[PDB]
């Protein structure tokens, strides 16, 4: 679900407070070769690394039920992955670069998380918030790795809830109640059928289920 | 203290309207002691029951009073500007009626006006005293036909107390309200509002104008007439905790008094809500304050419930709909409580065999 | 969605009746606690052990809120009212609210009869870079979660 | 707000203690190519990185009121961002470079913070102090990633407050007071209207505001 | 601006009446603390539990001051005056000031009847680099924030 996070970032940057000019948002790596060809004020949103948010992981058999108010599937809670974006502003004049970076920071500040309504279909099917943290705390080594030159930058962290889908199937529902067989441990009295739940008890349980 | 204090319970102040020598006219004066009363108003220097009523109120135990003088030789509209008042009386109405200067129709009109005023403010209950020299049948007729009051904010007390008058050194007949109200205050200082102020002693009373038997009480009690009776080894005691209301749900004095006390305390504590935003924060604050106030009442045993949830419930969330009562700048809170009824009759059964 | 499906972000707030405090830097642990009471007895005729744990009274605590040092002295006035014994106005009802996104209150902890008892100024250093921090210890007789 | 700080730095450096000569303050990256073209003594103030001051962040619903002494908006406290500037002095003679660096230190030391009135309109609208730290407290890696060569430098840290204002609105003020309805929990006595605040109580509460 | 709006930087100072000290390196925590008394009771008629927390007394304390030690021996003379029993001159009123950016006093902790109780020399090391410091512990009967 990175092809939804990048689209959300592009829509937010284009549709944010930077409506004065039609700036271009690019995900290309800001290397020297890339920087030597651009001729328009642009915003680079290069993906840097992918890590799993081990602090927000949850383990447990989550029940999934149909319209009959009976559980039919067993799944696992989604695992959160942290995606880091290096955000930079490229413009001919350094003060223009500074004001572009300020505008980007101002348009990214108010969104602490992202409601599922804004998210696209694939990510919005989760119906879960998508945290988005700007800045919030090595950059020299990263910039050297891309081969570019150190510039002021924003570290945008997005927490994508990737799914774990083993999708275990539960057994058929128990409709005729439970039957209990009782007897002696050593087998001196033979085990009996022991009967089962009366229809009145089953009806009462099915009525109280609502 | 009205902008930062939370909701807290309320002293009981009695407002007395009548005639008295000297003092101001139609000006509610706060009196905290009998010495203050004689320093401001006059002592027993005339044929007025106001001095006797105040003396009985303070002797029986009274935190404060609001004395009002309208025609004292040698008015309820002025009491609408005071909030702490919880009961009212008109001791000198019967004093004027006895002379024949005022007919029974005017007395009934004055009592109806007093009851209507009590129903308006909504925080006080009136005390009614019948004309003197009346029997059980006579008082039943007077209460059912001539003065058929029907209100939840009124309590009637039939027999007149005979107290001591230092002016003449003899015993004089006065209405019991001035004493009875004091008894109420004693309850609020010794047993709380949740307990019916029935089994109490009229300290200032020496004798009664007519002893009431159980046969006459069997007819007086159901019509909402509270009696005062003398018991051997117990003295003069009030017998009856009923109001002058036909509603069975509001036929007990303690329930109405407790409801009025709770309403007044909540209204006093929620005085800071004026000009506050009508959002969820204000509703949460109101709910928290009301719950913190009511849990103390639940702990004291005034309300019935194993847990606070079953004894009281507060609903102030989403009740004030955005287009009704919110565009009008109002906030509505709903409170439900479970009081305890008193045990009026005690029945014993003796069996010879064992 | 489901109540368990919506997580909670550290977007919190406080509200003290009578004390004008807007924002807090941090809030300590507030817990709801109870007393467990073990008692061990042997079953009498046969001798098998049977230890039981059972409920005891609930407990009061001390929620502390830390706010950056400024000119305002709301906590100073609170503790000054406390030390003089005027507890008719010192005992206040407090609320700690924690909300998810969209700024909708999710959980509220109501402190009944909360009353501050300790104000600590952060250590002052000449070469210090961080702002001064004020620590306030607010003890409460009762804490009700809502 | 980055450009506002830049303008502040330029005005402070030009109008500080370095009034003997018309020195030039430049924000260009001090790379080898940039250093090989300059021919006049200059002061480089290159922006290095942007970080959020998480230690000065405050969370709460700040009330904003109009002239009627009634709150009409609910905002959030601003978040402080740490902007780092690498400050260097470039001159032909090394002793002249040392003298220029000493002059910059002398002109930047006495300003621990910044008064709101001396700030530009965008920065001065917050009416909050702006801390400024000179050489408060790795530089080899920064210079290597920047592309230049190691030189004595100043790590100028400026704390810019960015307002994270959500502009959440509040409800209309309560003018009729509060009404309380009382009754039985089980519904045995019907719920009453319960009346509301008396007009004199409302008037007294309104008058006590002043 | 608003009193809460303006923050406080670690720019401070001290003023001791009779002791010529002008600057310090650090100041320990200054606590305004009140004793808390907890009492648990049960309602006689209903048996519900009520725990009440009420006030104690103002607590005396002590804050350590650590300055760059030098030839000056003002604190040495202070502790010498306190050591010989001349407490008429040993007890001095102290003030701790924290100022704003404009060097304008904001908070002034007034310290009543303060006398030095302990002077500690920093550990001396042959290969030590930083300056050698001196620690002073001062006990004040009362600490009123103004």
Author numbering:
A (entry chain 0B), D (entry chain 0A): 1 to 137, 143 to 215
B (entry chain 2A): 15 to 24, 31 to 94, 252 to 531
C (entry chain 1a), E (entry chain 1f): 4 to 149
Which of the paper's sentences describe this entry?
The distal end of the CISSc is capped by a tail terminator complex. This cap comprises one protein, Cis16, forming a C6-symmetrical complex that terminates the inner tube and sheath, respectively. (e) Top view (left) and side view (right) of ribbon diagrams showing the cap module of CISSc, revealing that the cap is composed of a Cis16 hexamer. The resulting maps of the baseplate and the cap reached resolutions of 3.5 and 3.4 Å, respectively.
Bacterial contractile injection systems (CIS) are phage tail-like macromolecular complexes that mediate cell-cell interactions by injecting effector proteins into target cells. Using Streptomyces coelicolor as a model organism, we and others previously demonstrated that S. coelicolor CIS (CISSc) mediate a form of regulated cell death, which influences the onset of sporulation and secondary metabolite production in response to exogenous stress and unknown cellular signals. The purified assemblies were subjected to single-particle cryo-electron microscopy (cryoEM) for structure determination, yielding the first high-resolution model of the CISSc in its extended conformation, which also presents the first example of a CIS IId subtype. Our model shows that extended CISSc particles share the conserved eCIS architecture, including the three core modules: cap, sheath tube, and baseplate.
